[PDB]
Design a protein around this nucleic acid. Structure first.
Ligand code: MG
Ligand code: MG
Ligand code: MG
Ligand code: MG
Ligand code: MG
Ligand code: MG
Ligand code: MG
Ligand code: MG
Ligand code: MG
Ligand code: MG
Ligand code: MG
Ligand code: MG
Ligand code: MG
Ligand code: MG
Ligand code: MG
Ligand code: MG
Ligand code: MG
Lengths: 63, 226, 97, 25, 127
RNA sequence: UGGAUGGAACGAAAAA
RNA sequence: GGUGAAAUUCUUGGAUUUAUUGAAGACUAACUACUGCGAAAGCAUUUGCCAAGGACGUUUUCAUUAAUCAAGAACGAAAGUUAGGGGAUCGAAGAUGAUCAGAUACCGUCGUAGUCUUAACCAUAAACUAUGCCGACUAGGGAUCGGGUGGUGUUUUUUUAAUGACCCACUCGGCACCUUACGAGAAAUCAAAGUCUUUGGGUUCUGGGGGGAGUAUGGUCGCAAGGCUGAAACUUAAAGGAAUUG
């Protein structure tokens, strides 16, 4: 059960039917220069660190 | 939908790649490169003789690989397998064609498209159908924004293209023609023949399609692969 | 009363226009009345371009295009967040955005 | 009700009256 | 120096097909579809499903010996949508990230010259 | 240089 | 495979998929636009044959031979009928799976008649520009199609000529478009829906509150569905058009 540590670099905005989810552009601690866009449940700012059960999934961006 | 089978068997394991071996495809002399690719088939058992399964196969390869230069980027080429010579199965020409993305980029609105086809026959009893395509050009100092043809220039241009294709194929066998089309001299002729009618930028020819084959005559094919 | 000068199409002097089929609901609609759009889009993305470019042979290959024309019925066009509506006098405006 | 279906109903009613009249002559 | 295969992604709606074949195309290798790696009947075209299948087929490719692949994307075509599905695009990025090499991508969606008839009736699909 | 369709929802006595 | 989500359906007798061929029928994509032709319906692959047509050019001919039309006549979308052929795709009826209180409806899978063609019929449409035809006059702007004229204009041929394709100017005939309203209108709007109380260029057709009713009856055409002409008794104070505020 490997995991991945990823660093938030820029928040996009709220998303979801009820505004309880946040879109963030997060950047991996290891093997840098790769940025992915993921959804976050709870309160979050920039510069936080997330742990991911998997890395290969890019959430549906609304822009 | 993994568990969706109500019934898997109307009435009521072996790895297949341990039985399969590779083969190297060879192109005729009229190409800068000769090494095309590699292909898989089963054991040529006493009941199959896999050379039979290879006899009527067709492989599509981009021309840019065959010539090295990237200007022939789109330019698909179709090659037909004909003879198996010790893991170096041989191929000859079967058809040329354009790539959809290019073909669609050819056609834009606010200009006139001109198309023509022909069913000429070669000296080698080969029966070929060749297609040609053209679009009108707005010259420098153009002010009007559409630049259409007058439907009689189109008739003349199509007549010229039709006759010139025949006069370029009659007498020619096949390979000269292949080496005429690799440097695209045919379309080079078109504007020289039509510049007194209408501009006609961008006169790439089209796909070419084969229709009828004569008897095999192994020796001619062997001549291409020295 | 009359709502548009062309009455919703571009037919003046024809009578019949040889209709086509909507791409979404397959409703029949005259060609000129249709709401044709041109969809030119690069094949992959604006995101995975870096991945494919580095993980591909032929450096700086082509990244070619893709071209589809779309035809929507009036109802589908409105329902798919396109040109939806405009105000009374603003409807006369012809130019694109 | 819609005019087209009015016309269709009337057409049927006329057809029925026609045949019932032809039943006697 | 290199070994090529041919991808032939079928990027339809409601499902996604990935199977690599020999350069001739008569011999196929490791046909896996998104619908056999999930149990939803609604996610058969989901990008996650297509990505996960693409990793599987890439595994078979790598263990057989194909290292690079030529790409042929195609939609349903004919009289149908003619636009690529959602998961096929994700699958392409998946198998590309899996380790193989990519060259000469083309679109081969079957487009007609004004074919017979689109289903749905004159007045269209009403919903 | 982007991108989503997306379930069900009948009726309201007469006059002012 | 299908949807919002599923199911009917097909799959170890190998479905969906991939390659090489072959057959059948339908269509003529992208080029395709406030562009063209036709009396209207309508007409989009190439080439050949047959006849037809508008506009332009004209110091050619006849000489008023003309405009509109009761009666009468040709053409006339789709659907439909009769008899052959063809019969891929789609698909009224129908069979089936869903949703729902019910759902013989919308949604899904099949599926006869039909969709195509030959020989005949039928003669209707929101057949719409809801604006009859001919003739004259009245405000400005550009663009476009066909033809003709002028210009040391550009490009290409053979620097060069004639051509051709463009540029500038002009004109005739078209499909229209942009601004304004002297003018018209109840208004929406209109270069005609203007030159109408300061009421008259020529001419055909239609209407007199809403229903009953395009019904009944009588003629006439058709094998049939139906078409053309077309009432009355009785009932009712409002129906209706365009705009304003909610
Ligand atoms: Mg209204
Ligand atoms: Mg009409
Ligand atoms: Mg009740
Ligand atoms: Mg009730
Ligand atoms: Mg099979
Ligand atoms: Mg065409
Ligand atoms: Mg034209
Ligand atoms: Mg008259
Ligand atoms: Mg009528
Ligand atoms: Mg009328
Ligand atoms: Mg007049
Ligand atoms: Mg002119
Ligand atoms: Mg003019
Ligand atoms: Mg016109
Ligand atoms: Mg009266
Ligand atoms: Mg009355
Ligand atoms: Mg009103």
């Amino acid at each position: 059960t490997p995991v991945t540590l990823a660093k938030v670099i820029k928040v996009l905005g709220r998303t979801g039917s009820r505004g309880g989810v946040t879109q963030v552009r997060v950047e991996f601690l290891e093997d840098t220069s790769r940025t992915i866009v993921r959804n976050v449940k709870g309160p979050v700012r920039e510069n936080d660190i997330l742990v991911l059960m998997e890395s290969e999934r890019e959430a549906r961006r609304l822009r | 939908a993994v568990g969706k089978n109500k019934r898997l068997s109307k009435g009521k394991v072996v790895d297949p790649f341990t039985r399969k071996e590779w083969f190297d495809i060879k192109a005729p002399s009229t190409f800068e490169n000769r090494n095309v690719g590699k292909t898989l088939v089963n054991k040529s058992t006493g009941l199959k003789s896999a050379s039979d399964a290879l006899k009527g196969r067709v492989v599509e390869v981009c021309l840019a690989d065959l010539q090295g230069s990237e200007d022939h980027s789109f330019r698909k080429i179709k090659l037909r397998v004909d003879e198996v010579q010790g893991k170096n199965l041989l191929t000859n020409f079967h058809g040329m064609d354009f790539t959809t993305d290019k073909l669609r980029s050819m056609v834009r609105k606010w200009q006139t498209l001109i198309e023509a086809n022909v069913t000429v026959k070669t000296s080698d009893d080969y029966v070929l159908r060749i297609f040609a395509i053209a679009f009108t050009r707005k010259q420098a100092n153009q002010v009007k924004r559409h630049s259409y043809a007058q439907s009689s220039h189109i008739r003349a241009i199509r007549k010229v293209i039709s006759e010139i294709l025949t006069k370029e194929v009659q007498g020619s066998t096949l390979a000269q023609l292949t080496s005429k089309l690799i440097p695209e001299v045919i379309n080079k002729e078109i504007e020289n023949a039509t510049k007194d009618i209408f501009p006609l930028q961008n006169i790439h020819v089209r796909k070419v399609k084969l229709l009828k084959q004569p008897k095999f005559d192994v020796g001619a094919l062997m001549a291409l692969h020295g | 009363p009359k709502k548009r000068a062309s009455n919703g199409r571009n037919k003046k002097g024809r009578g019949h226009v040889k209709p086509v089929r909507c791409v979404n609901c397959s409703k029949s609609i005259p060609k000129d009345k249709a709401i044709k759009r041109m969809a030119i889009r690069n094949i992959v993305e604006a995101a995975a371009v870096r991945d494919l470019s580095e993980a591909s042979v032929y450096p700086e290959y082509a990244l070619p295009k893709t071209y589809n024309k779309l035809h929507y019925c009036v109802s589908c066009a409105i329902h798919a967040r396109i040109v939806r509506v405009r105000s009374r006098e603003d409807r006369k405006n012809r130019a694109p955005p | 009700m819609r005019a087209k279906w009015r016309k269709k109903r009337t057409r049927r009613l006329k057809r029925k009256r026609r045949k019932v009249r032809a039943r006697s002559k | 120096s290199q070994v090529f295969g041919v991808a032939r992604i079928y990027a339809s709606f409601n499902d996604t097909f990935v199977h690599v074949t020999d350069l001739s195309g008569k011999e196929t290798i490791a046909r896996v579809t998104g619908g056999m790696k999930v149990k939803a009947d609604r996610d058969e075209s989901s990008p996650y499903a297509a990505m996960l299948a693409a990793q599987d087929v890439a595994a078979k490719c790598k263990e057989v010996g194909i290292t690079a692949v030529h790409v042929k994307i195609r939609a349903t075509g004919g009289t149908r949508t003619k636009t690529p599905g959602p998961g096929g695009q994700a699958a392409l990025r998946a198998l590309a990230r899996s380790g193989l090499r990519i060259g000469r991508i083309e679109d081969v969606t079957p487009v007609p010259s004004d074919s017979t008839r689109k289903k749905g009736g004159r007045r269209g699909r009403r919903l």
